Amino acid sequence: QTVFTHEQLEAYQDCTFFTRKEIMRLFYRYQDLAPQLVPLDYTTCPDVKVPYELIGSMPELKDNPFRQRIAQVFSEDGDGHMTLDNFLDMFSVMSEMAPRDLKAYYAFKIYDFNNDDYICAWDLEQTVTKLTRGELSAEEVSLVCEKVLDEADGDHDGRLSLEDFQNMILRAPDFLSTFHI
Amino acid sequence: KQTVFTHEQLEAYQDCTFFTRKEIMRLFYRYQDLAPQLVPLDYTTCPDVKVPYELIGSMPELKDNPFRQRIAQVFSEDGDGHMTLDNFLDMFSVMSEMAPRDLKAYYAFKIYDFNNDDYICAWDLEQTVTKLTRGELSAEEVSLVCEKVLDEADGDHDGRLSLEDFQNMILRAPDFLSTFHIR
Ligand SMILES: [Ca+2]
Ligand SMILES: [Ca+2]
Ligand SMILES: [Cl-]
Ligand SMILES: [Cl-]
Ligand SMILES: [Cl-]
Ligand SMILES: [Cl-]
Ligand SMILES: [Cl-]
Ligand SMILES: [Cl-]
Ligand SMILES: [Cl-]
Structure with missing residues (x-):
């Protein structure tokens, strides 16, 4: 070599x-x-x-x-x-060798568009929209963003810290996709 | 008429x-x-x-x-x-589009409760996530999702999700780490 x-x-x-x-x-x-x-x-x-x-x-x-x-x-x-x-x-x-938490660190960095160390409602809305790739309507996306912030906003400041984000069930599937006809 | x-x-x-x-x-x-x-x-x-x-x-x-x-x-x-x-x-x-989120979740709880015992256990959860993620998550990845869901959402610490546990989950949030796992 x-x-x-x-x-x-x-x-x-x-x-x-x-x-x-x-x-x-x-x-x-x-x-x-x-x-x-x-x-x-x-x-x-x-x-x-x-x-x-x-x-x-x-x-x-x-x-x-x-x-x-x-x-x-x-x-x-x-x-x-x-x-x-x-x-x-x-x-x-x-890589498959990288731990979940490290991937979440860098995921947080790419979703923090204005680089202020928070995922705000606008960052979150932009992120969910791009990830669901049309699977969700704009109205469904907003509902998702509202509950995520309801559940995960530890400081009750309207935005997600890295700590809030790492504590989320980041990879769980859309359990309600099957109920739309 | x-x-x-x-x-x-x-x-x-x-x-x-x-x-x-x-x-x-x-x-x-x-x-x-x-x-x-x-x-x-x-x-x-x-x-x-x-x-x-x-x-x-x-x-x-x-x-x-x-x-x-x-x-x-x-x-x-x-x-x-x-x-x-x-x-x-x-x-x-x-x-229908008219049905509220909580109503769909009520019936989702029932379909994913495969043995109709009013709880979503680890097996129910594994079966459900597996079916929802075919070709997207590996068996190993499915397992770690199920482990965290239970850790974060099992309010009674009985190893199972109640209806209340399920309703309170971020049920429709996307896979935020798909961007860092390669297909
Ligand atoms: Ca930001
Ligand atoms: Ca069950
Ligand atoms: Cl080596
Ligand atoms: Cl991961
Ligand atoms: Cl291209
Ligand atoms: Cl009528
Ligand atoms: Cl009609
Ligand atoms: Cl819904
Ligand atoms: Cl099928």
């Missing part, structure tokens, strides 16, 4: 959930996105970004309604243009 | 459902259409008539519903899915 030194490869294992082999597989995926831009030796610590247009078109992000903000959040400078470090960080968090 | 029902019958159906008299008439014809040789055009004599489940579950409105069998059982007179007109109208009433 000639892409990385031992130091930097151990550093990637230290700061991700991946094995050395998985890091190498992900590197060659990253390099494959822009083979004439991304170098094949990172021992010199090159400063290289793959444009967002190539990140958002990956099969793992194509059909994600939040692909733009995921890429923004993990990109070095918030524009979705990703270094190798950014790319490995994103896929580490998205 | 129509000749299927008496004035009193149609007034009573309007009183006990969310439907208008004209809507009741349209739904009767839908029911009668399922089996015209079985369902009479005269209900003024209060006929005892059931449409077999096989014709209920194959309705355009129910055939794609993963819980169509439980829905028919819960609304059927005797719990076997063979439905009278009254059962049929009650089912459509609860499933």
